[PDB]
Amino acid sequence: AQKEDMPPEHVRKIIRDHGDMTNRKFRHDKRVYLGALKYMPHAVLKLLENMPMPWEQIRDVPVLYHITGAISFVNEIPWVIEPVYISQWGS
RNA sequence: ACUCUGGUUUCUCUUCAGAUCGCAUAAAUCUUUCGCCUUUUACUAAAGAUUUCCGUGGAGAGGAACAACUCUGAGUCUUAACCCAAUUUUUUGAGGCCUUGCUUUGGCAAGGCUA
RNA sequence: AAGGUAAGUAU
Incomplete structure (x- = not known):
């Protein structure tokens, strides 16, 4: 499962x-929309920590988003090989 | 060269974290010392004690994927041509006889005789 | 960010 x-x-x-x-069509259920909005700083933190590096054009990242579009999270931790990351930034 | 050994990856969950959880580093609260002082909310910067947060390790459990592919370890880790013995065992000249002591007798003990 | 609201009665 x-x-x-x-x-x-x-x-x-x-x-x-x-x-x-x-719009009054989706205003019937707002507790589900409102209750997931307190985690906006988490979305901010996950978004900025996955910012693409200067050597990368497009960065497709896994995304965890609320069912109503209230909030979207970047469900990824930017793991980088330390020698590779240092060499890339030196170049 | 024989036989059995039986993974790796990934997603969750539950707990334990000594250790640079982290070769990196935030915030909040409280209590002391200050700095600003004029009241909140912000603060100044040191110390001490907490909490939260971003992450981490080990172990346990439950799913999935490559489940079929092999490991490692253990087990005795198992074979013939031609060439060889003075320090431990298949080539090794180490034989016998007698004396006297002694053992209930058998035998044993020492010496002598060699070839 | 505040310590900078006049209290009203009508429409």
């Missing part, structure tokens, strides 16, 4: 709609 990954277009659509809270 493991959660299968969703297509990247699913979260794209979820973010694209429900953008403004003024």
Whole structure:
């Protein structure tokens, strides 16, 4: 019993709609939306620590996002080989 | 050269963490010393004691993937051509006889005789 | 970031 990954277009659509809270269609359930918003600093911390390095053009990262698009987390720790990382930054 | 030994990867969970949990390094709270002082919320910078957070290790448990592929260790780790013996055993000249002591007798003990 | 709200009655 493991959660299968969703297509990247699913979260794209979820973010694209429900953008403004003024819509009254999804206002019925907001405790699930509001309760997951306190972890915004966690999303900030995970996002900035996975910032791409100057030698990298595009960095695809695993993403853990709320079912309503309330918050998105970068579920990845930037592990780097120390000699490789130091040599890359020296270059 | 024989036989048995039986993994690695990955995702969770539960606990234990001495150790540079971390060859890196944040914040909060409290109690003392200050610095600003005029009241909160911020602070100044040292010490002491906590808590949280970003991470970490070991062990245990439960799933998945490559489950079929081999390891290591142990087990006795198992074979013939031609060439060899003065220090321990298949080439090794080490034989016998007698004396006297002594043992209930057998024998034993020492010496002598060699070839 | 505050210690910088007049208290109102009408529409």
